[PDB]
Ligand binder design. Structure first.
Ligand SMILES: Cc1ccncc1NC(=O)CN(C)S(=O)(=O)c1cccc2cccnc12
Ligand SMILES: Cc1ccncc1NC(=O)CN(C)S(=O)(=O)c1cccc2cccnc12
Lengths: 304, 304
């Protein structure tokens, strides 16, 4: 029993973190096979952050200008290329600690773990979700760029995020490992305001199922609703619309608890309309939305 | 910017997790040097959980009865002994991945990371605090016993907790790595009710400092208080008494933000008396107490 915001074990990813320096800028790189992936803004000075022409800036850079250090040993850069907003630095040595891996682009509502790093060194690990406005609410300081987000399926690490920037509102933006930003964000210091940060309805329902499994049942009511009725309330509260795909995905949780998905929707509807009344659910006074139905099943079953 | 509940990178601890089986019971062990540490209840059957005589039960066990598996390879047990509530299984091979380590016994209010494991395999990592009633609010299922809590200081892992049990209220109890339980708990299935789970006042204040550093300032008021006045309110709300030692420990946060500790106490006092009014602090609708002043400085400065 107990339900915690849990990150994947980070060891497999720690074995991939390296430091990349270009001129005066130092950030993190991800070393998989003989390639080091890092944000392309490593080539920029803070003076040219307003409107960088990455292609032009890259022309002035050679392999020897990218300093890659894995622990206290230097890696030899034998090639460099830009793919969207990431640089791929080909090194002469394959990372001996390269785990089985995939590059995936996640959808909003999907959760992942972040290994926050500075100077190629891991500082901590936390669990995130890709927000519906394509930002992440992380914990990143200057030097953390190049830190990655990932999920693990037994021994295969699926890398889904690379940290690139902080927006003026303190929220974060980044790319997948092909260098494509999530959302409309760009690696420029310019007016980039995030859209509505709506609540991930399917994740809240999964977390309400976790609460029932762990003994927190006070919010369960005598009501039911329909997808259409629920969604009228969800729109009113800036919650994402719930679809039949979401209902189906909650099927195993519904089956384990014996609580129909639409009955849990009615419980959630009453929580939205009435509030918590000073009560808590799984030690929280707000409805948590950074647990997917897959995370709930995984944590409640002990998947290793 | 951003402030997250962050665990230490778990790699150094993943390299220590092993599976220990004695008869029909399987749990986790911690392999450091040529010793495997695990809860002594691995020798018990669920049938004798009410009143186990560990010394007598251990007499019927020999080295070959403890099956220790590190990955998919078996370790040879050449000795076994009981130290308080842990078994120390001497193996013939020193763990080649043994990090620099210490065994520490923490005080209530101190935080640590837990690497939840099943069958010697890591499933996830989360951050905990030793509660003032000596329980932890973890996430542990059957098979998770022997999972450890730790802190990391650069390259030295300080092991502070080993999971042993779940109380009927769904809270957790365990020992330090010398096998001494935190609090009055025993490794028996008996009436063991936890005391008052008071709030760790010094940690809440540290977290209010983190909120100010990260832009959440709405709760700052025009008031101050004294330690004695604050403590009258703290007792009323089941908050731990704040001492001059706590005030001193918050000195660096006070210095960085320019907000006197007693002024932050008055802000906290008003939050206790008035509530949040539907507002949030660092994405939370309740006052978080599982960040120490050291965790706040570490996360806000990027210690690796
Ligand atoms: C500070 C911080 C905190 C947390 N997470 C990410 C960051 N960094 C950033 O957001 C990066 N910026 C300072 S930036 O202005 O977006 C930028 C754009 C383009 C080229 C650049 C070259 C060098 C430095 N910056 C550049
Ligand atoms: C189930 C669970 C979930 C989360 N975290 C810890 C647990 N286990 C427990 O609490 C362990 N118990 C089932 S127990 O009753 O306290 C116990 C005491 C003594 C000897 C025993 C031998 C074998 C199994 N149990 C024994």
């Amino acid at each position: 029993s107990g339900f915690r915001k849990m990150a994947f074990p980070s060891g497999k990813v720690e074995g991939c973190m390296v430091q990349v320096t270009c001129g005066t800028t130092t950030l993190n790189g991800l070393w998989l096979d003989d390639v080091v992936y890092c944000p392309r803004h490593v080539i920029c000075t803070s003076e040219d952050m307003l409107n960088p022409n990455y292609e032009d800036l890259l022309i002035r850079k050679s392999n020897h200008n990218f300093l890659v250090q894995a622990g206290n040993v230097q890696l030899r850069v034998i090639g460099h290329s830009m793919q969207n907003c990431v640089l791929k630095l080909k090194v002469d040595t394959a990372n001996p600690k390269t785990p089985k891996y995939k590059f995936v682009r996640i959808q909003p509502g999907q959760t992942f773990s972040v290994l926050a790093c500075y100077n190629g060194s891991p500082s901590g690990v936390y669990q995130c979700a890709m927000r519906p406005n394509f930002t992440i609410k992380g914990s990143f300081l200057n030097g953390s760029c190049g830190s990655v987000g990932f999920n693990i399926d037994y021994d295969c690490v699926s890398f889904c995020y690379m940290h690139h920037m902080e927006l003026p509102t303190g929220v974060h933006a980044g790319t997948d490992l092909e260098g494509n930003f999530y959302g409309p964000f760009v690696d420029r210091q310019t007016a980039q305001a995030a859209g509505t940060d709506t609540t991930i309805t399917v994740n809240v329902l999964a977390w309400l199922y976790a609460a029932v499994i762990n003994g927190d049942r006070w919010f369960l009511n005598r009501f039911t609703t329909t997808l259409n009725d629920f969604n009228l309330v969800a729109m009113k509260y800036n919650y994402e619309p719930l679809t039949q795909d979401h209902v189906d995905i909650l099927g195993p949780l519904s089956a384990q608890t014996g609580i129909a998905v639409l009955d849990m929707c009615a419980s959630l509807k009453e929580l939205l309309q009435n509030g918590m009344n000073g009560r808590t659910i799984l030690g929280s006074a707000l409805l948590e939305d950074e647990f997917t139905p897959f995370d709930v099943v995984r944590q409640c079953s002990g998947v290793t």
